[PDB]
Amino acid sequence: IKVRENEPFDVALRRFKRSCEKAGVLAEVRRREFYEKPTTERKRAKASAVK
Amino acid sequence: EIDYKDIATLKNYITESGKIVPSRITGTRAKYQRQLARAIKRARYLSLLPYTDRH
Amino acid sequence: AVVKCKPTSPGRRHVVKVVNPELHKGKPFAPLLEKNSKSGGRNNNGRITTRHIGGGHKQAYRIVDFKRNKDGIPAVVERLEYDPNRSANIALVLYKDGERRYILAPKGLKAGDQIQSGVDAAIKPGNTLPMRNIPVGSTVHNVEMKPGKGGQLARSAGTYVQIVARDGAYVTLRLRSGEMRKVEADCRATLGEVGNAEHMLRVLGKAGAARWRGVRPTVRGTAMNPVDHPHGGGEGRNFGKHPVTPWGVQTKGKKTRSNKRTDKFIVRRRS
Amino acid sequence: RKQVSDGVAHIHASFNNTIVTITDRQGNALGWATAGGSGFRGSRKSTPFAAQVAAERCADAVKEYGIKNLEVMVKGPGPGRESTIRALNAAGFRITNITDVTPIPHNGCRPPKKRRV
Amino acid sequence: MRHYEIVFMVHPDQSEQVPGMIERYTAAITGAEGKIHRLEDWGRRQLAYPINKLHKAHYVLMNVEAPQEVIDELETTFRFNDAVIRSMVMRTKHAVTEAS
Amino acid sequence: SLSTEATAKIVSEFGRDANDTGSTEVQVALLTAQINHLQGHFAEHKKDHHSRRGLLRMVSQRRKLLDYLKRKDVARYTQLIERLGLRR
RNA sequence: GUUUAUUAAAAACACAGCACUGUGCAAACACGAAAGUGGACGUAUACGGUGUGACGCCUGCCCGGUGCCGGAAGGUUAAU
RNA sequence: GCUUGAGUCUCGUAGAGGGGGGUAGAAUUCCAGGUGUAGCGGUGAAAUGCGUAGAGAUCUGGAGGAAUACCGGUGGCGAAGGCGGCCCCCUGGACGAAGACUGACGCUCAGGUGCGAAAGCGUGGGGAGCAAACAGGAUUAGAUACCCUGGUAGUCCACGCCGUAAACGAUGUCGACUUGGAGGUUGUGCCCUUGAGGCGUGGCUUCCGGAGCUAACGCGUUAAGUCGACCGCCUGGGGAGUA
């Protein structure tokens, strides 16, 4: 979660949060408890991941 | 993997923010991913490892 | 155990009893009994001061130990008994030096059960000890308000008081009312909650049951003439007035606490 | 006044508004500025521009403290946050840490239903 | 008589009462003719997260074979004792003796 | 299920010898032992509807074997249910 | 069940049950120039007041008026 | 009588199978307090709502309830409904390896009995979040809706009831035979284990396809192919799964 750097620093370059929290994990927990849509969203996500 | 007190090994199999790493990344056949995770959780109860990095 | 009576003869149709097989079927312990003469609701002037009281069954008073002074001596619960003067049951207990006393019976307490009053008592239900030694967030009954005086809070059946704070020489207590009250922390209190909760589930069923607990009928105000009650009169049913006591003071809302002496000790009124 | 010389910039980016609070290391606030309090009410208070002018305006109003070092703590998602920390090192601050402190439940409370728009 | 692995943290300020406790606990095991296989005192070790805040605490690893009743009263001993925070007793995984 | 020492004891009591562990009296007695032990378990719990399904498999299977042994040798049947205290 | 002893026994009163409201104990409340007493040797699962009146299905909308509860900013406001 | 069906015993394996008890960490809400100050929240835009009685933000302490991120996977277990932190206790089943034992003890099953999501009902608790009803704000021609702000039953626990679902692989159960390929998961045997290998042999499962079948679509060794046993059900649409 943290970053620090010594005096050679210019830019933020914190892409630790395109790794874990920001993009998916908080936008996922904005909306409803189903049990049902996730079983089919994961079903078609794993059925789309195919050659 | 079988053991939870070896937190060097467990600390390899965990990310920088306390989260268990998927076997999609680290190899780790599923039996040992299950033993692994369960050992990580037993270690987080004992405060050998952290649950997160914002305690 | 609550029991609906079978509806033979109306009068029994709606009765729910609270039976208790663990109460002592027999005579109470005699040298802790005394005469309790019934008053009728009438003061030393003869006048009815509290209305609706009178008749009912003859009752003998049972000296219940509210103080719990025998400190450090253990006591085994000899039995549980029916007390007519209270909602709760009383436990007759026997100290190790051969002295029997009646206490209010807490919830889990059966016959053959160790209780122990005093500072170094174990924290388990039935043990009276000062509230600077009880943990915060514990259900506690038979609470003293002044040290040494006797228990006055949470005595009625199924009733507890939760200790929520220990700020200094005082403990903040959530009374069963919902009211937060400060009590001095040297005041003893008995652990657990007092134990006949199912008392509130009984339904009495007929008019004579109320009569035999000593509760005479209540004539309602609007049924009277105007000379009697402020509600009075009127050619069929006629209310038209703001509801009052028989002495003209507003019922239905109007707050009647005036103390100013114990307002220091009230952290929050009930709601 | 009181001359703290190190603080924390808690930026609270949400979807509708970013709110920047500059405090000390004890956690006592020294001065705040929101994107909605900088003009542009409404669809324009959730933009990176509004967040950066919110952060410029929060860099002002802590001149009375002589803050030179600060950590940055970032909550929530939002069109803000990224631009926000930029505005902070456009205001002479030595930005030391950038932590992201978004609250994530470990499957706690049930989130609200919504949005059949 | 099955196997158990007991660990328990102790409050750091009562660390000097640690080996005494150990003896008593081990004594309780020998009250039931159960045997104790390893025993480790791991020292005051830094906690990964604060608990009542209280950082660095004193760990004791035990690994006892016993009947389940003395293990149960050992658990209640860990309940009431204010010294010990976080016990954990586990599975058989038949008797171990090694280090980590 | 049942202890190894318990199963060995019942095989030793009901079989022709040890290693005769599949005879009809032996299977019936092992099922009986487990049925009674789980009477103790299901007096408590009472909402372990999954474990009970295993128990009713034991009851039904015991019943099938008693029906077999009844229509093969009735003397073994009467000695068996006499010894196990079943049939009520 | 009770009631107009002596023209009214009833659909009226009562009632169990329900609800609202007051009451933290030196309780509210009542009798009492006061002391005191009843409430109660009870303690909110208790006690007082008010309405409705077993049980079953239910109890909709209105807070502008009158009351009550709460608020404290401003206006007005006694003795001094 | 016999062992190739069915079952018992020995040793292990994997598992969110069940029931009871305990505990842990994040987060939401509330309460008390510190800093601090003019907005916060919300939306397509707004307003209702909260806020100088000091909100929102932020830090500290506390209470409480529910759910258990990451692992997590057309992964696993269960007859089905379903089951997801960690630990203990009680307990069911499955599968594998070699050997021993019983000896057809088997398959299906009308009536019968049991289990059976969710909502609902009864009694007693609990009540943080979410949220039918409800209220207000908008939107609109209207808006008893979608959207916003609140919000009660309910959701949670104990015991009892109900007895249903697109309770669905829209595919009854049991058994036998019939070309293949790529995986997943869990056992086991053999070989320089010369490593994250090579060769087999089981259990469960996913995708694609051959013959065959099928109205077609598709199914395709887990069949909707080729057969056998027993059960359940169908007979034009509506009326009506109603009286």
Curated annotation (Swiss-Prot), chain A:
The chain holds residues 4 to 54 of 71 of the full protein. One of its GO terms (biological process) is cytoplasmic translation. Belongs to the bacterial ribosomal protein bS21 family. It comes from Escherichia coli (strain K12). The keyword Ribonucleoprotein applies. Probbly involved in recognition of ribosome rescue factor SmrB in stalled/collided disomes; fusion of protein fragments to its N-terminus decreases ribosome rescue in the presence of SmrB. Part of the 30S ribosomal subunit. In stalled ribosomes contacts ribosome rescue factor SmrB. Residues 43-51 have a biased composition (Basic residues). Transmembrane segments: none annotated. This is Small ribosomal subunit protein bS21. GO terms for molecular function: rRNA binding; structural constituent of ribosome. GO terms for cellular component: cytoplasm; cytosol; cytosolic small ribosomal subunit. Keywords: Ribonucleoprotein, Ribosomal protein, RNA-binding, rRNA-binding.
Swiss-Prot record, chain C:
NCBIfam families: rplB_bact. Belongs to the universal ribosomal protein uL2 family. Disulfide bonds: none annotated. Part of the 50S ribosomal subunit. Forms a bridge to the 30S subunit in the 70S ribosome, contacting the 16S rRNA. Interacts weakly with S6 in one of the 3.5 A resolved structures. In pull-down experiments interacts with CedA. Residues 38-47 have a biased composition (Low complexity). Residues 27-52, 220-271 are annotated as: Disordered. The keyword rRNA-binding applies. This is Large ribosomal subunit protein uL2. One of its GO terms (cellular component) is DnaA-L2 complex. The keyword Disulfide bond does not apply. Pfam families: Ribosomal_L2 (PF00181), Ribosomal_L2_C (PF03947). This protein can be partially replaced in vivo by its H.marismortui (HmaL2) or human (L8, from the 60S cytoplasmic ribosome) homolog. One of the primary rRNA binding proteins. Located near the base of the L1 stalk, it is probably also mobile. Required for association of the 30S and 50S subunits to form the 70S ribosome, for tRNA binding and peptide bond formation. It has been suggested to have peptidyltransferase activity; this is highly controversial. One of its GO terms (biological process) is cytoplasmic translation. InterPro entries: NA-bd_OB-fold, Rib_uL2_dom2, Ribosomal_uL2, Ribosomal_uL2_bac/org-type, Ribosomal_uL2_C, Ribosomal_uL2_CS, Ribosomal_uL2_dom3, Ribosomal_uL2_RNA-bd_dom. GO terms for molecular function: RNA binding; rRNA binding; structural constituent of ribosome; transferase activity; zinc ion binding. The modification N6-acetyllysine is found at K241. HAMAP family: Ribosomal_uL2_B.
Curated annotation (Swiss-Prot), chain E:
5 different forms of the protein, varying only in the number of C-terminal glutamate residues, were isolated. The sequence shown is form bS6-6, which is the longest. The first two Glu are encoded by the rpsF gene, the other Glu are added post-translationally by the RimK enzyme. Keywords: Acetylation, Ribonucleoprotein, Ribosomal protein, RNA-binding, rRNA-binding. One of its GO terms (biological process) is cytoplasmic translation. The keyword Repeat does not apply. It comes from the Bacteria. GO terms for molecular function: mRNA 5'-UTR binding; small ribosomal subunit rRNA binding; structural constituent of ribosome. This is Small ribosomal subunit protein bS6. The chain holds residues 1 to 100 of 135 of the full protein.
UniProtKB/Swiss-Prot annotation, chain F:
One of its GO terms (molecular function) is small ribosomal subunit rRNA binding. Keywords: Ribonucleoprotein, Ribosomal protein, RNA-binding, rRNA-binding, Translation regulation. PROSITE patterns: RIBOSOMAL_S15 (PS00362). GO terms for biological process: cytoplasmic translation; regulation of translation; ribosomal small subunit assembly; translation. Coiled coil: none annotated. Gene3D superfamilies: 6.10.250.3130, S15/NS1, RNA-binding. Transmembrane segments: none annotated. GO terms for cellular component: cytoplasm; cytosol; cytosolic small ribosomal subunit. Induction: Part of the metY operon that extends to pnp, also has its own promoter. InterPro entries: Ribosomal_uS15, Ribosomal_uS15_bac-type, uS15_NS1_RNA-bd_sf. HAMAP family: Ribosomal_uS15_B (MF_01343_B). One of the primary rRNA binding proteins, it binds directly to 16S rRNA where it helps nucleate assembly of the platform of the 30S subunit by binding and bridging several RNA helices of the 16S rRNA. Binds to its own mRNA, stabilizing it 5-UTR and preventing its translation. In the E.coli 70S ribosome it has been modeled to contact the 23S rRNA of the 50S subunit forming part of bridge B4. In the two 3.5 A resolved ribosome structures there are minor differences between side-chain conformations. Part of the 30S ribosomal subunit. Forms a bridge to the 50S subunit in the 70S ribosome, contacting the 23S rRNA. Belongs to the universal ribosomal protein uS15 family. This is Small ribosomal subunit protein uS15.
